[PDB]
Design an enzyme around this catalytic site. Sequence first.
Site, short mmCIF file in Angstrom:
data_model
loop_
_atom_site.label_atom_id
_atom_site.label_comp_id
_atom_site.label_asym_id
_atom_site.label_seq_id
_atom_site.Cartn_x
_atom_site.Cartn_y
_atom_site.Cartn_z
N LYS A 62 0.83 -1.22 0.00
CA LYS A 62 0.00 0.00 0.00
C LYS A 62 0.86 1.26 0.00
O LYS A 62 0.69 2.19 0.79
CB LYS A 62 -1.02 -0.02 1.12
CG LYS A 62 -1.99 -1.18 0.97
CD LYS A 62 -3.00 -1.11 2.07
CE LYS A 62 -4.00 -2.21 1.94
NZ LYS A 62 -3.30 -3.50 2.19
N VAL A 63 1.76 1.28 -0.96
CA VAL A 63 2.81 2.29 -1.01
C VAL A 63 2.17 3.67 -1.02
O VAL A 63 1.26 3.92 -1.85
CB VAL A 63 3.71 2.08 -2.25
CG1 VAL A 63 4.82 3.11 -2.24
CG2 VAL A 63 4.26 0.66 -2.28
N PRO A 67 7.09 10.75 -4.10
CA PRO A 67 7.63 10.01 -5.26
C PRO A 67 9.01 9.39 -5.02
O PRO A 67 9.21 8.22 -5.33
CB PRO A 67 7.66 11.09 -6.36
CG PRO A 67 6.49 11.95 -6.00
CD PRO A 67 6.49 12.03 -4.50
N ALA A 174 -14.13 -12.77 6.07
CA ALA A 174 -14.06 -12.16 7.40
C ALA A 174 -14.67 -10.76 7.46
O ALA A 174 -15.31 -10.41 8.44
CB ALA A 174 -12.63 -12.13 7.91
N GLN A 175 -14.45 -9.94 6.44
CA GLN A 175 -14.98 -8.58 6.44
C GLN A 175 -16.43 -8.49 5.98
O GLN A 175 -17.01 -7.40 6.01
CB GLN A 175 -14.10 -7.66 5.59
CG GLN A 175 -12.69 -7.49 6.12
CD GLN A 175 -11.85 -6.60 5.23
OE1 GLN A 175 -12.23 -5.46 4.97
NE2 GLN A 175 -10.76 -7.12 4.71
N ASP A 178 -18.93 -11.28 -0.20
CA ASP A 178 -19.36 -12.56 -0.77
C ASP A 178 -18.57 -12.89 -2.03
O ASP A 178 -18.47 -12.05 -2.90
CB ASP A 178 -20.85 -12.49 -1.12
CG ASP A 178 -21.35 -13.76 -1.74
OD1 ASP A 178 -21.48 -14.74 -0.99
OD2 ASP A 178 -21.58 -13.79 -2.97
N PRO A 179 -18.06 -14.14 -2.16
CA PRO A 179 -17.27 -14.47 -3.35
C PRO A 179 -18.00 -14.24 -4.67
O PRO A 179 -17.48 -13.57 -5.58
CB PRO A 179 -16.92 -15.96 -3.15
CG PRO A 179 -16.94 -16.14 -1.69
CD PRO A 179 -18.04 -15.24 -1.18
N1 LIG Z 1 -5.30 -4.88 0.17
C1 LIG Z 1 -6.32 -4.54 0.98
C2 LIG Z 1 -7.10 -3.43 0.62
C3 LIG Z 1 -8.34 -3.22 1.24
O1 LIG Z 1 -9.17 -2.34 0.88
N2 LIG Z 1 -8.71 -4.13 2.19
C4 LIG Z 1 -7.96 -5.21 2.56
O2 LIG Z 1 -8.37 -5.94 3.49
N3 LIG Z 1 -6.74 -5.38 1.99
C5 LIG Z 1 -5.86 -6.50 2.45
O3 LIG Z 1 -6.49 -7.70 1.98
C6 LIG Z 1 -6.48 -8.71 3.01
C7 LIG Z 1 -7.84 -8.92 3.63
O4 LIG Z 1 -7.71 -10.15 4.34
P1 LIG Z 1 -8.96 -10.83 5.08
O5 LIG Z 1 -9.92 -9.74 5.51
O6 LIG Z 1 -9.62 -11.76 4.09
O7 LIG Z 1 -8.32 -11.57 6.24
C8 LIG Z 1 -5.52 -8.20 4.06
O8 LIG Z 1 -4.19 -8.62 3.71
C9 LIG Z 1 -5.64 -6.69 3.96
O9 LIG Z 1 -4.50 -6.12 4.66
#
Ligand SMILES: Nc1cc(=O)[nH]c(=O)n1[C@@H]1O[C@H](COP(=O)(O)O)[C@@H](O)[C@H]1O
Lengths: 215, 215
Positions: A62-63, A67, A174-175, A178-179
């Site tokens: 997540k850089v 620059p 987890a969040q 849905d796939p």
């Molecule tokens: N790249 C991300 C951008 C974002 O918006 N949300 C997110 O969760 N991630 C990353 O995706 C993964 C989500 O994992 P999980 O919620 O399925 O465990 C983690 O590595 C987060 O740090």
Amino acid sequence: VMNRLILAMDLMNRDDALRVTGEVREYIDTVKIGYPLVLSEGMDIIAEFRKRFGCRIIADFKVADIPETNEKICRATFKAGADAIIVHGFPGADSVRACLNVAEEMGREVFLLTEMSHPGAEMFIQGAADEIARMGVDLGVKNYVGPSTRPERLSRLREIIGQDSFLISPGVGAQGGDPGETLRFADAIIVGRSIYLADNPAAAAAGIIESIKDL
Amino acid sequence: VMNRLILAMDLMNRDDALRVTGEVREYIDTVKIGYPLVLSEGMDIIAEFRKRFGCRIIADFKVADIPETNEKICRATFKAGADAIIVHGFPGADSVRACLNVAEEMGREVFLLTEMSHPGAEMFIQGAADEIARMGVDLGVKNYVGPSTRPERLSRLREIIGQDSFLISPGVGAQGGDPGETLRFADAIIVGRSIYLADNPAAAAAGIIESIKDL
Ligand SMILES: Nc1cc(=O)[nH]c(=O)n1[C@@H]1O[C@H](COP(=O)(O)O)[C@@H](O)[C@H]1O
Ligand SMILES: Nc1cc(=O)[nH]c(=O)n1[C@@H]1O[C@H](COP(=O)(O)O)[C@@H](O)[C@H]1O
């Protein structure tokens, strides 16, 4: 990517990370490695995974710097063997261009993170996200990240970037995402905890894939 | 901090980073270590510096993930010996709170990055920056980062956070910012390239300090 499923390997122990990744390797061809693992075990973990598993590695860093520093971060990450790096768009076009320049130098890819999946993303990122996506298009970005937890937002992002751009999406499981719904708009889903904290990660991955095939 | 000057040690080689930091150690008590050095030499560099130089270490990781991942990043960083970590505010309040919670658990500090110093910061961050700062105040953040390159913005940030909060500021020297003007609003300045790329880093640091004492 294999089965449209990317593993988010955020375990912080090399032994556990290797175990789980090996158990689910038959179901993926792409592992996303982030700072939880890298900062605990070292950047050498990237080349170790790439060799052991013969997977693609996306460095989820997540850089989000100026620059000049972004250039340095990208170069160190590609030197370590990453295939691609995830970059924030919120710092603006010069910061993104710096990452694109290093990727072009080193034959790698940048993924632009446009709108994040967690609740706090509503505060500042969401209101900028369409503009961030359009900035990506205007910079020639071809790979994007947007949120499984908001498929209407994920649809709008797809609308901006077009059908040719590659879109991957975290927040599945987890969040609350849905796939199947996510795959209406994204090319691939990212899944972390629903696999790596499962009692049986292979069965968790297989269950997800079985719902993907059905689409 | 000693002489109100924090070294941004973004050299990517341990030998060079150790050389320069040792040469300027008499003029600082605080070194900011970021991903250029960490991703090149390992997180063990933090404890090595802290011991060799007896300095404070601020980990400039611009933490910018979802709450759960932010927690992990902070914990790994404090485990490595960092005194403080720099966190982006743009991902919103839950992401910041996750970092604050780990800092409270581990007896460390969070610095909230509010508005960045590079030109691209104008695109999205600047318009959110006052709100990001107010969010910090409402979360109980006491340490902030804002831009040397825009002292009118740095004044507005100071206005929001009050006189008791600690404010540090990058963008001095290479990016165009001025030590004295920045110190009208910030408690300390961050300086990287103007010191570490100088033919004589100690003389560069001494020159900056001589202009600081004059204030
Ligand atoms: N790249 C991300 C951008 C974002 O918006 N949300 C997110 O969760 N991630 C990353 O995706 C993964 C989500 O994992 P999980 O919620 O399925 O465990 C983690 O590595 C987060 O740090
Ligand atoms: N923390 C930062 C926030 C920011 O807004 N700008 C900035 O340059 N930094 C960091 O400060 C240092 C600036 O160094 P220099 O421009 O003096 O070389 C670098 O480590 C940057 O990555």
